Design an enzyme around this catalytic site. Structure first.
Site, mmCIF file in Angstrom:
data_model
loop_
_atom_site.group_PDB
_atom_site.id
_atom_site.type_symbol
_atom_site.label_atom_id
_atom_site.label_comp_id
_atom_site.label_asym_id
_atom_site.label_seq_id
_atom_site.Cartn_x
_atom_site.Cartn_y
_atom_site.Cartn_z
ATOM 1 N N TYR B 137 0.867 -1.208 0.000
ATOM 2 C CA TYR B 137 0.000 0.000 0.000
ATOM 3 C C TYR B 137 0.887 1.235 0.000
ATOM 4 O O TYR B 137 0.621 2.199 -0.749
ATOM 5 C CB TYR B 137 -0.909 -0.020 1.241
ATOM 6 C CG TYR B 137 -1.764 1.226 1.462
ATOM 7 C CD1 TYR B 137 -2.880 1.464 0.661
ATOM 8 C CD2 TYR B 137 -1.456 2.125 2.484
ATOM 9 C CE1 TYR B 137 -3.685 2.540 0.869
ATOM 10 C CE2 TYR B 137 -2.280 3.288 2.703
ATOM 11 C CZ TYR B 137 -3.364 3.450 1.912
ATOM 12 O OH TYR B 137 -4.157 4.500 2.095
ATOM 13 N N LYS B 141 1.057 3.938 -3.124
ATOM 14 C CA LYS B 141 0.709 5.318 -2.820
ATOM 15 C C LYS B 141 1.897 6.292 -3.033
ATOM 16 O O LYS B 141 1.689 7.447 -3.431
ATOM 17 C CB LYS B 141 0.224 5.479 -1.374
ATOM 18 C CG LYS B 141 -1.176 4.907 -1.143
ATOM 19 C CD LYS B 141 -2.096 5.194 -2.317
ATOM 20 C CE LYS B 141 -3.614 5.106 -1.924
ATOM 21 N NZ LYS B 141 -4.419 5.871 -2.870
HETATM 22 N N1 LIG Z 1 -8.805 7.101 5.237
HETATM 23 C C1 LIG Z 1 -7.553 6.632 5.054
HETATM 24 O O1 LIG Z 1 -6.776 6.267 5.956
HETATM 25 C C2 LIG Z 1 -7.064 6.651 3.579
HETATM 26 C C3 LIG Z 1 -5.792 7.234 3.363
HETATM 27 C C4 LIG Z 1 -5.265 7.348 2.071
HETATM 28 C C5 LIG Z 1 -5.982 6.868 0.987
HETATM 29 N N2 LIG Z 1 -7.253 6.258 1.133
HETATM 30 C C6 LIG Z 1 -7.938 5.810 -0.164
HETATM 31 O O2 LIG Z 1 -9.345 6.203 -0.126
HETATM 32 C C7 LIG Z 1 -9.815 5.970 -1.481
HETATM 33 C C8 LIG Z 1 -11.330 5.690 -1.465
HETATM 34 O O3 LIG Z 1 -11.657 4.768 -0.418
HETATM 35 P P1 LIG Z 1 -13.129 4.104 -0.261
HETATM 36 O O4 LIG Z 1 -13.285 3.812 1.200
HETATM 37 O O5 LIG Z 1 -14.058 5.020 -1.044
HETATM 38 O O6 LIG Z 1 -12.977 2.708 -0.885
HETATM 39 P P2 LIG Z 1 -14.030 1.812 -1.639
HETATM 40 O O7 LIG Z 1 -13.460 0.440 -1.597
HETATM 41 O O8 LIG Z 1 -15.440 2.068 -1.235
HETATM 42 O O9 LIG Z 1 -14.016 2.263 -3.218
HETATM 43 C C9 LIG Z 1 -12.980 2.177 -4.127
HETATM 44 C C10 LIG Z 1 -13.643 2.068 -5.512
HETATM 45 O O10 LIG Z 1 -12.552 1.935 -6.469
HETATM 46 C C11 LIG Z 1 -12.939 0.938 -7.411
HETATM 47 N N3 LIG Z 1 -11.648 0.525 -8.028
HETATM 48 C C12 LIG Z 1 -10.695 -0.223 -7.413
HETATM 49 N N4 LIG Z 1 -9.667 -0.325 -8.270
HETATM 50 C C13 LIG Z 1 -9.974 0.319 -9.438
HETATM 51 C C14 LIG Z 1 -9.307 0.543 -10.683
HETATM 52 N N5 LIG Z 1 -8.101 -0.015 -10.950
HETATM 53 N N6 LIG Z 1 -9.918 1.289 -11.649
HETATM 54 C C15 LIG Z 1 -11.132 1.781 -11.437
HETATM 55 N N7 LIG Z 1 -11.779 1.584 -10.269
HETATM 56 C C16 LIG Z 1 -11.248 0.845 -9.270
HETATM 57 C C17 LIG Z 1 -13.612 -0.135 -6.530
HETATM 58 O O11 LIG Z 1 -14.451 -0.967 -7.348
HETATM 59 C C18 LIG Z 1 -14.435 0.736 -5.602
HETATM 60 O O12 LIG Z 1 -15.624 0.969 -6.321
HETATM 61 C C19 LIG Z 1 -8.910 4.859 -2.028
HETATM 62 O O13 LIG Z 1 -8.050 5.494 -3.039
HETATM 63 C C20 LIG Z 1 -8.063 4.419 -0.825
HETATM 64 O O14 LIG Z 1 -6.798 3.980 -1.344
HETATM 65 C C21 LIG Z 1 -7.839 6.160 2.472
#
Ligand SMILES: NC(=O)c1ccc[n+]([C@@H]2O[C@H](COP(=O)([O-])OP(=O)(O)OC[C@H]3O[C@@H](n4cnc5c(N)ncnc54)[C@H](O)[C@@H]3O)[C@@H](O)[C@H]2O)c1
Ligand SMILES: NC(=O)c1ccc[n+]([C@@H]2O[C@H](COP(=O)([O-])OP(=O)(O)OC[C@H]3O[C@@H](n4cnc5c(N)ncnc54)[C@H](O)[C@@H]3O)[C@@H](O)[C@H]2O)c1
Lengths: 230, 230
Positions: B137, B141
């Site tokens: 991860y 990132k």
């Molecule tokens: N809160 C934290 O600690 C934190 C910190 C940094 C990043 N994030 C990031 O938050 C973002 C959103 O999180 P979420 O909870 O909405 O997750 P989630 O799992 O609800 O949604 C992610 C969406 O991305 C789609 N997806 C996955 N890979 C894909 C690809 N290659 N192409 C197109 N679509 C794809 C999935 O089908 C899902 O619909 C993500 O980028 C995750 O990496 C969270």
């Protein structure tokens, strides 16, 4: 009787690292998409995927050998900014060649490397700055540098006392480079034997190592190579 | 009419961005593995590979739309250090979910973004530092962050006058975090609608935009959210 493993051991840097540690009577082991018949032990993988990586780790655990130095000299270069025609294809090729190998390296280190051992990834100096003409390369190399640093932690998965380092070339002297950039001043590129040399220094003498997690940049200028800990 | 396009448009964040933009009367478009029927236009991709990405761009293009704001909210989290059992799986999972989609966004933006457009990738605050317990991860990132910076350059391939940003949450209030940190104080989590609102402010008031290429960290403490441009 010391053992080195080289992921990408059939490439230009890879085989030089092999020729060299072999002249110095270390046992050399090589992992690549093609055979390197000049290593003492030599393996083929089909890809850098979980299955192929586990299956190669098991083959070396069957020869009951553990390594003192592991170097990943696997990688590759492709160009292109986001709007170029080649962009999408350079994405797959840089992830497969640079990232998956970097990650495979981590796993291999975690299973095969002895306590106190040396773990070296090849990054790219270019990736310390903007790579807008080669986005996929810069980003996959930047991920390489991130993994090198993560593995320097206590809890990163490598064994106790081991040092995780990055070597970061500006430019290497390869027949390839000499073909496709034939204009260039070859005296500003790094002989491969020099890289193998530094790698031997670190591998025989623990005091010479830089601090754990160092990215080490090297640049050659008029045949003189300077190594800088970053 | 203004268009916003959202990769990951069906995820928790992605669907809240669509909902909020739709309430301010923007036309919304979603690309994801499954449809977002709440969006004005919704596209499905079978993967993040070259051909799938060319097609969906080719589809949206042949419909004559260009977009004023692009947001990638696609991605996923998986744990593990280098020696753990789940490590190789976590590698392929994080590459496919975070890295392939950040790369796809670069292409989608180069092809569909209007001049002066806003282009945002979701990075991670934790990838600013060591991610020893979640190496795959952290590295994907870190690569995402580098792409953001390459896309800020006038040579990166995005149209004239566009702004490339990363939003880097400490902790979003998403079903994923509810599942993994269900003991937490939820008032220290950013509501997704505040992420949407910040995106909307940058989409409509170009003066409020951070410097092109900033990674923008944000963290909530007892319901007060602070955004810091790095
Ligand atoms: N809160 C934290 O600690 C934190 C910190 C940094 C990043 N994030 C990031 O938050 C973002 C959103 O999180 P979420 O909870 O909405 O997750 P989630 O799992 O609800 O949604 C992610 C969406 O991305 C789609 N997806 C996955 N890979 C894909 C690809 N290659 N192409 C197109 N679509 C794809 C999935 O089908 C899902 O619909 C993500 O980028 C995750 O990496 C969270
Ligand atoms: N050559 C330069 O000027 C230069 C500059 C900066 C960085 N580097 C880096 O130096 C390293 C080696 O450079 P080189 O010039 O010797 O390269 P090379 O192309 O001659 O050798 C690379 C080898 O890695 C192998 N390989 C590719 N992907 C692999 C994977 N996923 N798993 C295992 N093996 C894989 C290839 O099959 C090949 O045998 C690479 O990491 C390259 O990115 C080189």
């Amino acid at each position: 009787s010391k053992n080195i493993l080289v992921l990408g051991g059939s490439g230009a840097l890879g085989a030089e690292v092999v020729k060299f540690f072999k002249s110095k009577s270390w046992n050399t082991i090589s992992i690549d998409f093609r055979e390197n018949p000049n290593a003492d032990h030599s393996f083929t993988i089909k890809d850098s995927g979980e299955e192929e990586i586990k299956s190669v780790i098991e083959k070396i655990n069957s020869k009951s050998i553990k390594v003192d130095t592991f170097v990943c000299a696997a990688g590759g270069w492709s160009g292109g900014n986001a709007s170029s025609d080649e962009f999408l294809k350079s994405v797959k090729g840089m992830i497969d060649m640079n990232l998956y190998s970097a990650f495979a390296s981590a796993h291999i280190g975690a299973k095969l490397l002895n306590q106190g051992g040396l773990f070296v990834l090849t990054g790219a100096s270019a990736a310390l700055n903007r790579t807008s003409g080669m986005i996929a390369y810069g980003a996959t190399k930047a991920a390489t540098h991130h993994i090198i640093k993560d593995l320097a932690s206590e809890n990163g998965g490598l064994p106790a006392g081991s040092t995780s380092l990055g070597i970061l070339p500006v430019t290497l002297d390869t027949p390839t480079n000499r073909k496709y950039m034939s204009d260039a001043n070859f005296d500003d590129w790094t002989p491969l034997s020099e890289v193998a040399e530094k790698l031997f220094e670190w591998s025989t003498n623990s005091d010479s190592r830089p601090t754990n997690g160092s990215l080490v940049k090297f640049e050659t200028k008029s045949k003189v190579t300077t190594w800088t800990n970053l």
